[PDB]
Design a protein around this nucleic acid. Structure first.
Ligand SMILES: [Mg+2]
Ligand SMILES: [Mg+2]
Ligand SMILES: [Mg+2]
Ligand SMILES: [Mg+2]
Ligand SMILES: [Mg+2]
Ligand SMILES: [Mg+2]
Ligand SMILES: [Mg+2]
Ligand SMILES: [Mg+2]
Ligand SMILES: [Mg+2]
Ligand SMILES: [Mg+2]
Ligand SMILES: [Mg+2]
Ligand SMILES: [Mg+2]
Lengths: 55, 143, 145, 58, 117, 141, 106, 78
RNA sequence: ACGGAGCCAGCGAGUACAACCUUGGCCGAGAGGUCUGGGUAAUCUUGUGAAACUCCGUCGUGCUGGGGAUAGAGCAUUGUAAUUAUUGCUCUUCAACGAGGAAUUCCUAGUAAGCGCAAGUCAUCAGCUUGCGUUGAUUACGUCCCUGCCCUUUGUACACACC
């Protein structure tokens, strides 16, 4: 774990640059309006957030 | 009575203005004409090999007369249609920017187009005067 | 508007750069029938030669053919830009050329055999006859014919 | 703090989700019921509706 | 003709700096070298110069193994034998004068050719 | 003040706002006279109120139409309805009852949409198909 | 000595309607109570904040989606009004949900 | 990749003097003139169909009923 | 089909502890580059001057100016990094393809279909999806014949239930 090599790869962008903010997952992420919550947790917490099924 | 460009059909007025601009020796064509697609959307140069630049200048001048003021990027959005992207769905491709820039600078040299404070370029009193004059020319040409 | 077109002079067959070309087609699209020359390049070559665009290839005169031929072998002399040329920067000698009917296919073959000899991945893929530009092959090009 | 108003409301919602889930994790032994986030010109009041209020206070 | 790259002769090809080749090289190389360079290709160049120096002047120099595939073959690199990582094997490749312009990855086939039946 | 009113006519997403005044028989759309409507083959569509009513009915009446939104033919139908409704409203407001009733009899006996806005509007699309009310395809194997 | 009019501006936001309308009505009533000239609670297009999402957490099942959304209503107000009474109005009659913001613009 | 039609040239790519006297002789007696009608008689290629068709508007040999693009509608002058 | 000319939308989205939407002015043929200026948004991109479409010409039944796959060379952009071509652009080769068997899918009014745009994926990349709007129909307005569904009656040696 030499500091020059450990976690040395850049992560400024791409699939793994940002995480789920709920689960830390990198799949099925919703970046719209800075939600940064994956789709399933969004479906779970939408009503608390302010999102509702309307039409 | 008095007549503006709005009282004459678009295509006939544009053709007549192109012919009038071609007849007189002003409105220099850039040395790179006969070379260019006029946009990435097209795949061939204009069928009218010489004189098409006058048509484009006439259309541009009429457009600035009708609208508020128009820059170069807006003209790029105006001209240019759908590119045949091989085996992919067509999209909208903006027109070539150099051609429209040269058109606007040539219209500036002719005095028909003035730099607008709000950005872009608007119509000038002398140029709009010639536009009304040639609109009258076309209108009494019709009958 | 129309002309009798001087019966007895309108050619029907031509041999420009050792390929037979039918002359009744429009000049630019008649020139398009030689390898290494497309509608755009032929159109520009005809434009620079001052020959009429709407003319017919079987009716334009001989010195017109040789002037067109001269234009379309050393384009950079006649103000054809560095771009718009077929083979630019020419990785044998660095001089932007334009390949033609026999020259195009021949020089493409030397480039292909260079890629075969150089032992590049693109070269061996070309030697095998498979797709080169990185397309899926599970479903693409599954029939030789 | 300057940010798009729609994004600001989305952030307020996700912050309320933050608070609600954290309080659910913590005050579960307290019979936690709900949380209200009231915003005043100066203070961001956070009302906790729970059963064992006296133990919640501690 | 024996070999010229872009009008620059083979004899000039052996003795010539990187930057002139960059100016001679196509657009992709131009952007790659204009975008700055990693330290790893510099170390590879140093090791490979050392390997060329070490060889007693009349055999093929000792193969230098390397994982780097993303850097290209400069005129200084000719006359050298490198083992490019293939996923398992540092596949051998001797760097010919026609190496130039290309990467190393073209000569370490990351997949085995597929044979059916 | 000059006797003048403002009416409008709509299509799917087109909207023509027409100002009618006591003028000199002056009919402009987007600042251009009616004879040069954007298209060419629906031109008679936009003359239709003119000829159905008769030009002499409004010879001292001027027309100014600004049409926005929607495609070409939707805009044309918008100008149609706007001009017709402007004529009817002006005759009701300042001319007489029988005149307006005669105009309505001439209009509604021909292409009812001339005075009544069209009720059809686009159907929202749904998941499971590329169309508003179409599905994608089935495989079954 | 604050007689200089600040031509102040009061804008609002919410995800709900009745509370926002109530706050705006109280603001207008307060402005009228002290003889204030104003531009009314001009309505702004309710911005629909929409996200489409697949329902299945695992991709299996018939293709079924859903659309969650809020609306934001803005209803900004500007006042050609004195200083202290306007500010006192801003720091009073605040309802959770609706967010009040004040711009002097003087 | 077929060969079924087996079509010949079947079109006068260049007008000839005898064909000119033809096009002029039945410039009348063709009570309706168009591009397709002109090329139906094997004497016009189709690009010069428009050329001869526009040329006939010289001394009023035929009259126009409509001059929309993509076609033409001409009757015999009476 | 290709040239010019006409010039028409509605859903969106858009930068802060980061670097987004980009106008406008200069360059380049284009992708693009550069200099400035707006917009934390009915304010600026944006009237998203979108395509199909319309008008005037070139083409003329020729796998042809259709079709643009497969390749050769070059120019740029994002990227630590692009070869196994990221993607865009310029010149060229231009293949199969002649309305597609058995069979089978979707759909009864702003519907199908054609046409594109926006948003989600996004540092770069859609031929995808979710939405939106443009032009906009033929044919039903019925039936249990095929495939099934609901209720009732009947028969059953079936109940892991006609697999
Ligand atoms: Mg166009
Ligand atoms: Mg067109
Ligand atoms: Mg097409
Ligand atoms: Mg549809
Ligand atoms: Mg084509
Ligand atoms: Mg709009
Ligand atoms: Mg357009
Ligand atoms: Mg072809
Ligand atoms: Mg997908
Ligand atoms: Mg039914
Ligand atoms: Mg049993
Ligand atoms: Mg059985």
């Amino acid at each position: 774990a030499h500091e020059n090599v450990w976690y040395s790869h850049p992560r400024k962008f791409g699939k793994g640059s940002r995480q789920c903010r709920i689960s830390g997952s990198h799949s099925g992420l919703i970046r719209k309006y800075g939600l940064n919550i994956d789709r399933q947790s969004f479906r779970e917490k939408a009503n608390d957030i302010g999102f509702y099924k309307y039409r | 009575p008095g007549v503006s460009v709005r009282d004459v059909p678009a295509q006939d007025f544009i053709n007549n203005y192109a012919s009038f601009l071609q007849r007189q020796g002003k409105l220099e064509v850039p040395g790179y004409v006969d070379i260019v697609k006029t946009s990435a959307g097209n795949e061939l140069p204009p069928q009218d090999s010489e004189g098409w630049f006058y048509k484009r200048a006439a259309s541009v001048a009429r457009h600035i007369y009708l609208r508020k003021q128009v820059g170069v990027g807006k003209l790029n959005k105006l001209y240019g249609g759908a590119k045949n992207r091989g085996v992919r769905p067509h999209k909208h491709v903006d027109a070539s920017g150099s051609i429209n820039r040269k058109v606007l600078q040539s219209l500036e040299k002719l005095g028909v187009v003035e730099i607008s404070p709000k950005g872009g370029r608007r119509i000038s009193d002398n140029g709009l005067r010639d536009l009304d004059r040639i609109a009258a020319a076309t209108l009494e040409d019709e009958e | 508007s129309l002309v009798v077109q001087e019966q007895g002079s309108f050619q029907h067959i031509l041999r420009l750069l050792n390929t037979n070309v039918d002359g009744n087609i429009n000049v630019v699209y008649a020139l398009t029938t030689i390898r290494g020359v497309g509608r755009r390049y032929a159109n520009l070559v005809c434009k620079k030669a001052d020959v009429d665009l709407h003319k017919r290839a079987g009716e334009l005169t001989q010195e017109e053919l040789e002037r067109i031929v001269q234009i379309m072998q050393n384009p950079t002399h006649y103000k054809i830009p560095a771009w718009f040329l077929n083979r630019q920067k020419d990785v044998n000698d660095g001089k932007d050329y334009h390949s033609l009917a026999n020259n195009l296919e021949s020089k493409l073959r030397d480039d292909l055999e260079r890629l075969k000899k150089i032992r590049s991945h693109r070269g061996i893929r070309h030697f095998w006859g498979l797709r080169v530009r990185g397309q899926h092959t599970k479903t693409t090009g599954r029939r030789r014919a | 703090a300057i940010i798009s108003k729609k994004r600001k409301l989305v952030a307020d919602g996700v912050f309320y989700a933050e608070l609600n889930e954290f309080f659910t994790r913590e005050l579960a032994e307290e019979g936690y019921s709900g949380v209200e986030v009231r915003v005043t010109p100066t203070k961001t009041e956070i009302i906790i509706r729970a059963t064992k209020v006296q133990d919640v206070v501690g | 003709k024996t070999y010229s790259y872009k009008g620059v002769d083979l004899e000039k090809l052996l003795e010539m700096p990187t930057e002139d080749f960059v100016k001679l090289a196509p657009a992709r190389v131009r952007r790659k070298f204009a975008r700055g360079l990693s330290e790893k290709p510099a170390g590879l160049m140093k090791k490979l110069r050392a390997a060329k120096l070490s060889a007693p002047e009349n055999e093929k120099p000792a193969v230098v193994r390397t994982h780097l595939r993303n850097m290209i073959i400069v005129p200084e690199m000719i006359g050298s034998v490198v083992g490019v990582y293939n996923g398992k094997v540092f596949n051998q490749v001797e760097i010919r004068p026609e190496m130039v312009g290309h990467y190393l990855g073209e000569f370490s086939i990351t997949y085995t050719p597929v044979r059916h039946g | 003040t000059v006797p003048s009113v403002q009416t409008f006519g709509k299509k799917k997403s087109a909207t023509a706002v027409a100002h009618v005044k006591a003028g000199k028989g002056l009919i402009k759309v987007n600042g251009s006279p009616i004879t040069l409507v954007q298209p060419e083959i629906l031109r008679f569509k936009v003359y239709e109120p003119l000829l159905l009513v008769g030009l002499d009915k409004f010879a001292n009446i001027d027309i100014r139409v600004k049409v926005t939104g929607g495609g070409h033919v939707s805009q044309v139908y918008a100008i149609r309805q706007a001009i017709a409704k402007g004529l009817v409203a002006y005759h009701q407001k300042f001319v007489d009852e029988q005149s307006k009733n005669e105009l309505k009899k001439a209009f509604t006996s021909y292409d009812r949409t001339l005075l009544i806005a069209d009720s059809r509007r686009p159907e929202p699309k749904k998941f499971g198909g590329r169309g508003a009310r179409s599905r994608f395809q089935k495989s079954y194997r | 000595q604050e007689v200089v009019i600040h031509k102040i501006r009061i804008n609002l936001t919410s995800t709900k309607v009745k509370q926002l309308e109530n706050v705006s009505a109280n603001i207008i009533k307060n402005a009228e109570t002290f003889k204030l000239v104003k531009k009314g609670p001009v309505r702004l297009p309710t911005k629909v904040l929409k996200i489409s999402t697949r329902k299945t957490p695992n991709g299996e099942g018939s293709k079924t989606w859903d659309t969650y959304e809020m609306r934001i209503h803005k209803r900004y107000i500007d006042l050609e009004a004195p200083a202290h009474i306007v500010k006192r109005i801003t720091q009073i009659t605040i309802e959770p949900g609706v967010d009040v913001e004040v711009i002097i613009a003087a | 990749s077929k060969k079924s039609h087996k079509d010949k040239a079947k079109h006068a790519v260049v007008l000839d003097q005898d064909k000119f006297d033809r096009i002029m002789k039945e410039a009348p007696t063709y009570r309706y003139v168009s591009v397709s009608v002109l090329v139906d008689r094997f004497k016009l290629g189709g690009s010069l169909a428009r050329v001869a068709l526009r040329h006939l508007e010289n001394e009023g040999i035929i009259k126009p009923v409509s001059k929309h693009s993509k076609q033409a509608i001409y009757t015999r002058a009476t």
